[PDB]
């Protein structure tokens, strides 16, 4: 659709820290684009509180059923639902283990912030999202990792990842400096699945590699390319 292409191009040119306002204004302007735009454009992550367990979790479309959101900690919807969408018993076991592992991953690499993992069954495997949010020192990092697992033994893993990052300083010499934007990348691999190399380990390694690669690329794009451009403006 020409209008969808145009809205997506708008979202690539408008200031990256205003995604929510720009998305909400676009949907106001062409309401029929709402569903397609929300499935194509990444939104900064929102934190909710699981008051039963006393833990924060992240909200996205993958843990939404109707107007409620499922906690990865309690496996319950807020507001409550009678028959909300749930992972199978087998996959809920993996999802608990994945939430615990990525909690630790997050602590070691981010020393703060909030993570959540949601898994869902597929025909010949399963898929999942790994979400990490760390606010700053003003700024915020949001990562969204969507992983698809086909089990053949050995499994095939497909990872699509988006990092959204903004940072702002206010200093005597440089005034106010704001850097904002995003990067999306994709990786694939086959890995052996065993008791010693389980899915969660294969997935963690793939997410780890992706975030390190993305961080390094952002570092040159943010602190390198835009720097060089400034130095040629004057």
The yes or no reply on residue 187 touching other proteins (CB under 8 A) is: no
The yes or no reply on residue 50 touching other proteins (CB under 8 A) is: no
The yes or no reply on residue 29 touching other proteins (CB under 8 A) is: yes
How many residues does this entry show for the chain? 234
> Would you state the structure tokens that stand for residue 59, as one six-digit string?
């909200």
Q: How far apart are CA 136 and CA 68, in angstroms?
A: 28
Minimum distance from residue 35 beta carbon to other proteins (Å) = 5
Q: How far apart are CA 234 and CA 226, in angstroms?
A: 13
- Tell me the site size for other proteins, rule CB under 8 A: 105
Residues 125-184 that bind other proteins (CB under 8 A): 127, 134, 136-141, 146, 148, 158, 160, 165, 167, 169, 171-184
User: Which of these segments, 49-57, 71-79, 116-124, binds other proteins (CB under 8 A)?
Assistant: 116-124
Minimum distance from residue 54 beta carbon to other proteins (Å) = 22
Q: Are strands 125-135 and 68-70 parallel, antiparallel or unpaired?
A: unpaired
Are the CB atoms for 129 and 60 separated by under 8 Å?
yes
The yes or no reply on residue 31 touching other proteins (CB under 8 A) is: yes
User: Which of these segments, 49-57, 71-79, 105-113, binds other proteins (CB under 8 A)?
Assistant: 105-113
Q: How far apart are CA 127 and CA 136, in angstroms?
A: 30
Q: How far apart are CA 24 and CA 32, in angstroms?
A: 13
The yes or no reply on residue 109 touching other proteins (CB under 8 A) is: yes
Q: Which of 50, 78, 95, 211 lies at the binding interface for other proteins (CB under 8 A)?
A: 211
Q: Which is nearer to other proteins, 56 or 148 (CB)?
A: 148
User: Which of these segments, 36-44, 49-57, 72-80, binds other proteins (CB under 8 A)?
Assistant: 36-44
> Would you state the structure tokens that stand for residue 134, as one six-digit string?
């760390």
Q: How far apart are CA 199 and CA 158, in angstroms?
A: 12
Q: Which of 53, 59, 96, 193 lies at the binding interface for other proteins (CB under 8 A)?
A: 59
Q: How far apart are CA 138 and CA 207, in angstroms?
A: 25
């Amino acid at each position: 659709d020409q209008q969808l292409d145009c809205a997506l191009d708008l979202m690539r040119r408008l200031p990256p820290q205003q995604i929510e306002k720009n998305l909400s204004d676009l949907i106001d302007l062409v309401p029929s684009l709402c569903e397609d735009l929300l499935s194509s454009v990444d939104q900064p992550l929102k934190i909710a509180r699981d008051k039963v367990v006393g833990k924060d979790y992240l909200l996205c479309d993958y843990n939404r059923d109707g107007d409620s959101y499922r906690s990865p900690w309690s496996n319950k919807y807020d507001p409550p639902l009678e028959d909300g969408a749930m992972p199978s018993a087998r996959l809920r076991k993996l999802e608990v283990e994945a939430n615990n592992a990525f909690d630790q991953y997050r602590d070691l690499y981010f020393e703060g912030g909030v993570s959540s993992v949601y898994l869902w069954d597929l025909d010949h495997g399963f898929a999942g999202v790994i979400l990490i949010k760390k606010a700053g020192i003003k700024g915020c990092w949001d990562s969204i990792h969507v992983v698809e697992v086909q089990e053949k033994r050995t499994a095939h893993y497909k990872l699509t990842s988006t990092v959204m990052l903004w940072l702002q300083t206010n200093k005597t010499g440089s005034g106010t400096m704001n850097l904002g934007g995003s990067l999306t990348r994709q990786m694939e691999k086959d890995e052996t699945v065993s008791d010693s190399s389980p899915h969660i380990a294969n997935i963690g390694r793939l997410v780890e590699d992706m975030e390190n690669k993305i961080r390094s690329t952002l570092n040159e794009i943010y602190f390198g390319k835009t720097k060089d451009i400034v130095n040629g403006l004057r």
